[PDB]
Amino acid sequence: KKVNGTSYKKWSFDLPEMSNLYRLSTPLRDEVTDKNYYYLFDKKSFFN
Amino acid sequence: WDSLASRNVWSFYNGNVLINDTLPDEISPELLSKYKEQIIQGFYWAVKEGPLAEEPIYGVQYKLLSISVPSDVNIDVMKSQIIPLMKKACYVGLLTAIPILLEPIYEVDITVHAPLLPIVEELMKKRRGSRIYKTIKVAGTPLLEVRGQVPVIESAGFETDLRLSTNGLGMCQLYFWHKIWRKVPGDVLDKDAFIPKLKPAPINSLSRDFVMKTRRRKG
DSSP, X not given: OOBSOSSOXXXXXXXXXXXXXXXXXXXXXXXXXXXXXXXXXXXXXXXX | OOHHHXXXXXXXXXXXXXXXXXXXXXXXXXHHHTTHHHHHHXXXXXXXXXXXTSOOOOXXXXXXXXXXXXXXXXXXXXXXXXXXXXXXXXXXXXXXXXXXXXXXXXXXXXXXXXXXXXXXXXXXXXXXXXXXXXXXXETTTTEEEEEEEEEGGGOXXXXXXXXXXXXXXXXXXXXXXXXXXXXXXXXXXXXXXXXXXXXOOOTTOSHHHXXXXXXXXXX
């Protein structure tokens, strides 16, 4: 249910699994999630 | 409004308004009637342009005080004479009435979070006009409605200054409604005030600086 099988390509979780994983990962991943923060920091603006 | 003046409203310009106002209007109104369109055509012609910068005129009302007409008008009062004459007179009148320059202003609609308010205030100050007409808490959301006004000549880049200084939070819209030209600070016709090239004009005069740069382009 959790996995593709032995090969280990392809994965899917339940909600609580995700929420635990997310919560634990929070210290490492912090970003200004809104597209808006990167007004002049995206690729296009750099290219320009 | 004065009852005679109201009855004597001839027409509007390409903008403001023309009134007849003298004893000769009673002395020879038929004669004068023959010259209305020539006057009428001219005035749109004259007010559409201008004595300072060849630019259109606002907030000005004109009143005919006197009109001498050639003895026996032998096809003498021609459009070739009176149209330009009238134009000249307008220009002189404006000059002697102490002219000023007017500058268009936008309505600044800014949406922000409350603690970003001080930033916005400073931006307004920096731009030039630094005017905020109203601040309204947006009931139901963590946002303010900020209404201000800003001189279009100082508007270049304004929106990005906002976006950058607020770190992406909030936003601005500039809309022209009401179309109101505010008096440009300095006296329209004083030589002395300006300081050398490449320096933003001192506040006392933005009227004198504005004319010369435009004056040169005209010729």
